[PDB]
Ligand binder design. Structure first.
Ligand SMILES: [Mg+2]
Ligand SMILES: [Mg+2]
Ligand SMILES: [Mg+2]
Ligand SMILES: [Mg+2]
Ligand SMILES: [Mg+2]
Ligand SMILES: [Mg+2]
Ligand SMILES: [Mg+2]
Ligand SMILES: [Mg+2]
Lengths: 129, 25, 217, 144, 54, 125, 111
RNA sequence: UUCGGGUCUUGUAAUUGGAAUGAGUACAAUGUAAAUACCUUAACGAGGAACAACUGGAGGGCAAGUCUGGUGCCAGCAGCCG
RNA sequence: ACCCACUCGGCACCUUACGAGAAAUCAAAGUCUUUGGGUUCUGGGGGGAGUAUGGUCGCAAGGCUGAAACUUAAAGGAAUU
RNA sequence: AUCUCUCUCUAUGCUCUCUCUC
């Protein structure tokens, strides 16, 4: 079995980026993945995503800018506290200030900076750049 | 040196030891 | 006898280009060390290590010496070279030439506070030559280049203020380590970061524009 | 795909695995089996003292040569027979048999120095005087 | 004879020279600095310190 | 017993003892500012290192956070009081730099020699 | 030629001569007949004095001069120990005979 | 024109000085349960020989000598290489 | 039954590297410093050693499990002349 | 579709080691 759909999607995206291909096909998709993509779009890491979210499960096709470098996951979604977020950023993000650690928080799925602004940490979902 | 031969030798030694133990008993 | 063979070299000689930056932009086949000397004024010729090297063929040994050269100014662009040769001085010279030919620029990055003047490194950057993996983690102001002496020297030559490094593999092979470091440095500018993002249109090459002056007929 | 388990509730297993693996680190094993106390003549101790039995000039390992000069020591605490080397040139002329002597290791975490087989310990304080001092004149030993 | 206690029993012990008192702590450091970074006549060539009678 | 009599180490010894360039630098500093002990230089570096650590920590906390507003400012004030930091230079990045030369310059050993009174650093000492 | 000609014997050169001066006795140093040539540099050699001993080869002769059974040999006895002792100098057959003639060693063993 | 002044500032050697000091000593005063020691302080107190810094090293690792005499696979060094 | 066009599933190839390799090599040994798709199981210098001691499973032979003391500065992998 | 198809004992060997200046 595929256990983490989001992870697989991210892997696919990464592979596409590596290739230089400017379109993907996320296979099972839906909800969390969609939200992640939305967040990415907000900062403009992916160009435009369109899903044949049909009568089954959903299939996302991402027309992407290619400016995205890498987009991770971590499937043991660790319960991030408001202080060790810095540590996480240091570990995961390349630059000190460029890039976004994706957090699934009670306030919703968004990047790290936005979470900080709302002062709600949650669980790590992934990261871009 | 071959390892199989060594193993065989060891086994033989073990057997001998066992025999000795039996005798003692 | 400073007569060039290549067209770029000829152009450089004539004086219709004064910028290495342009060359870097258009990725030009440099094969004359003269060009770099002409354009890049002050560059420190530094030899790292001289490894004795042999190939034991019938009648005794055959001692060749492998010199490692790191060249560069103290502001951005850094040269890197290696040569095996019979005499040591000659080998060193050859390495220097090669290093000059190589010379690669760094995207000298920041930490967040900005303030002023090109500082340390852009991102967490890596490169592997052998097993050896070199990290370059951009270290805050004054946090002196922390590395293998060789790597420290290379960084100094480049013109980096403060960097954290992390080693993997057998770093006792100094040459390999140096190569890895060079690769990592190269990677720094070959990386997409929000400071790039906004696309700037292509400028024509000096090789295409000044093509009439490069050729003598 | 990274052989070790990576789950949120997978912790216990991970810990146990780590524990099991640790048992292969030689140092850790030494620390925890109690071989520092159960085995080894310097039983946990750092600077055991004993007494001279025989004054064997032990022949060295190869590339090198020369007769090396060592001491048979009966340790006062445990009472094991020990082969312990004496530093400097002709310090044997200050040791003598039936004399009390303090010993140390070899900067070797046990084991043996790079020429002397069987030897594991430096003779350091002959009758509580120290050998270095004796060597460089400095102080004189109680003997008669 | 191949017996223990050679060399030092054989070699004549030549006594230590009198020598003018080489300074201490701060002064010594200063002297060292003067020796190494103040002048040095070997400006062209190498940054070598200890020479030889050769 | 009494208890709270705590003794602090005050200096850091370098991890590599014969890294030549570092040693040379130290020697040069000693020559410049008359120093009996390399532990003096080491002491000062340790102090500076501590300051740097604090600054780093402050930076780790975001711009115009309460901690940053307090501790950083306090540090800056302290530095100004000693001297060392310039009056234009009060922005934490400067603190992160600070060199090593400046602490060996704003000290009685050098401060006496700075206006005269001695005509040599050893004399001043 | 030394032992077996070889490709790998011309990188040595031996200099002593057959017409060399015979070495005499010293203090803590005496003459031994070899009882049995043992392994690993060790050798069982009965002294002319009247003690059994255990003889040991010490450098020098370890590769340069090969030895056999029942040979007259200079042994410097250990001054601190006694049971383990070391070979210093091998005597030639002619040399041995001369020594015997002289009467420097006790007449008990034959060459 | 062949120097040179050393004009401007230093480095250098037993040379030769002209000024400081606490470390011991200490009238005493302070200190203190009483006295030590410190903080204060009148008297005595440095010309290299004194009022004396050792401790490791100098093939590499690793800063530092293809110096001088001795020993000669011995004596011994050497954490490992050697 | 043949022939072309496709796929689906399987054993495999050949070609490259644009990756990964310490390389030899690899369409996985790739997506592994830009390091967390899920899980089991093993290894931590070589030797002593798969030995000694226990335990068990066995008619036995043996298998499963599995040390330490001591011992050395190498053993080993791939390539190169 | 053109190969053609050859053959046996032979054991062992102990004596080092080496860099420069950039
Ligand atoms: Mg010859
Ligand atoms: Mg006082
Ligand atoms: Mg000394
Ligand atoms: Mg050196
Ligand atoms: Mg010594
Ligand atoms: Mg093991
Ligand atoms: Mg059993
Ligand atoms: Mg090998």
């Amino acid at each position: 079995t595929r256990t983490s759909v989001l992870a697989d999607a991210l892997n696919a995206i990464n592979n596409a980026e590596k290739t230089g291909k400017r379109q993907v096909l996320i296979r099972p998709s839906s909800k969390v993945i969609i939200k992640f993509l939305q967040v990415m779009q907000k900062h403009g890491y992916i160009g435009e995503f369109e899903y044949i979210d049909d009568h089954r499960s959903g299939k996302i096709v991402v027309q992407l800018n290619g400016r995205l470098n890498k987009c991770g996951v971590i499937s043991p979604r660790f319960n991030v506290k408001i202080a060790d977020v810095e540590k996480w950023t240091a570990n995961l993000l390349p630059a000190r200030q460029f890039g976004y650690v994706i957090l699934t928080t009670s306030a919703g799925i968004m990047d790290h900076e936005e979470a900080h602004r709302k002062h709600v940490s949650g669980k790590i979902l992934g990261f871009v750049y | 040196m071959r390892a199989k031969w060594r193993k065989k030798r060891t086994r033989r030694l073990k057997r001998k030891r066992r025999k000795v133990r039996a005798r003692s008993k | 006898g400073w007569v060039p063979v290549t067209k770029l070299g000829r152009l450089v000689k004539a004086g219709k280009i004064s910028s290495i930056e342009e060359i870097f932009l258009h990725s030009l086949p440099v094969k004359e060390f003269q060009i770099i000397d002409q354009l890049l004024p002050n560059l420190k010729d530094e030899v790292m290590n001289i490894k004795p090297v042999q190939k034991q063929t019938r009648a005794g040994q055959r001692t060749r010496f492998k010199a490692v050269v790191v060249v560069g100014d103290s502001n951005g662009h850094v040269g890197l070279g290696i040569k095996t040769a019979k005499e040591v001085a000659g080998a060193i010279r050859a390495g220097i030439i090669i290093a000059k030919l190589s010379v690669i620029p760094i995207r000298r990055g920041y930490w967040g506070t900005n303030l002023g003047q090109p500082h340390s490194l852009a991102t967490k950057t890596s490169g592997k030559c052998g097993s050896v993996s070199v990290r370059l983690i951009p270290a805050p102001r004054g946090s002196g280049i922390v590395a293998s002496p060789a790597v420290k020297k290379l960084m100094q030559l480049a013109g980096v203020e403060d960097v954290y490094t992390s080693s993997t593999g057998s770093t006792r092979t100094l040459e390999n380590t140096l190569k890895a470091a060079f690769v990592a440095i190269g990677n720094t500018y070959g990386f997409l970061t929000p400071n790039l993002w906004e696309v700037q249109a292509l400028t024509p090459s000096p090789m295409d524009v000044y093509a009439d002056y490069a050729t003598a007929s | 795909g990274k052989g070790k388990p990576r789950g949120l509730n997978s912790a216990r297993k991970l810990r146990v695995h780590r524990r099991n693996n640790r048992w292969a680190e030689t140092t850790y094993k030494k620390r925890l089996l109690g071989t520092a106390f159960k085995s080894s003549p310097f039983g946990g101790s750092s600077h055991a003292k004993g007494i001279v039995l025989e004054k064997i000039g032990i022949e060295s390992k190869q590339p090198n040569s020369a007769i090396r000069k060592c001491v048979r020591v009966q340790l006062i605490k445990n009472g094991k027979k020990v082969t312990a080397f004496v530093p400097n040139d002709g310090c044997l002329n200050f040791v003598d048999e039936n004399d009390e002597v303090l010993l140390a290791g070899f900067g070797r975490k046990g084991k043996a120095k790079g020429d002397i087989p069987g030897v594991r310990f430096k003779v350091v304080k002959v009758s509580g005087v120290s050998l270095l001092a004796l060597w460089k004149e400095k102080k004189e030993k109680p003997r008669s | 004879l191949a017996r223990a206690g050679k060399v030092k029993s054989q070699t004549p012990k030549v006594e230590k020279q009198e020598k003018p008192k080489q300074p201490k702590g701060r002064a010594y450091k200063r002297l060292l600095y003067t020796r190494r970074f103040v002048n040095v006549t070997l400006t062209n060539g190498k940054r070598k310190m200890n020479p030889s009678p050769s | 017993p009494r208890a709270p009599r705590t003794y602090s180490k005050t200096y850091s010894t370098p991890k590599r003892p014969y890294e030549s360039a570092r040693l040379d630098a130290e020697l040069k500093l000693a020559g410049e500012y008359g120093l009996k002990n390399k532990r003096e230089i080491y002491r000062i570096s340790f102090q500076l290192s501590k300051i740097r650590r604090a600054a780093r920590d402050l930076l780790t906390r975001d711009e115009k956070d309460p901690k940053r507003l307090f501790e950083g400012n306090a540090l800056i004030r302290r530095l100004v009081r000693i001297g060392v930091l310039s009056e234009d230079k009060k922005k934490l990045d400067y603190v992160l730099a600070l060199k090593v030369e400046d602490f060996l310059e704003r000290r009685l050993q050098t401060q006496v020699y700075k206006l005269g009174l001695a005509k040599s650093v050893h004399h001043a000492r | 030629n030394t032992k077996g000609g070889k490709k790998g014997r011309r990188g040595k050169n031996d200099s002593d001569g057959p017409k060399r001066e015979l070495i005499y006795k010293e203090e803590g140093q005496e003459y031994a007949q070899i009882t049995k040539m043992l392994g690993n540099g060790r050798v069982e050699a009965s002294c002319f004095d009247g003690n059994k001993r255990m003889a040991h080869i010490r450098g020098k002769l370890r590769k340069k001069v090969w030895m056999g059974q029942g040979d007259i040999i200079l042994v410097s006895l250990r001054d601190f120990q006694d049971d383990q002792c070391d070979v210093v100098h091998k005597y030639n057959l002619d040399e041995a005979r001369t020594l015997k003639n002289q009467g420097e060693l006790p007449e008990n063993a034959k060459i």
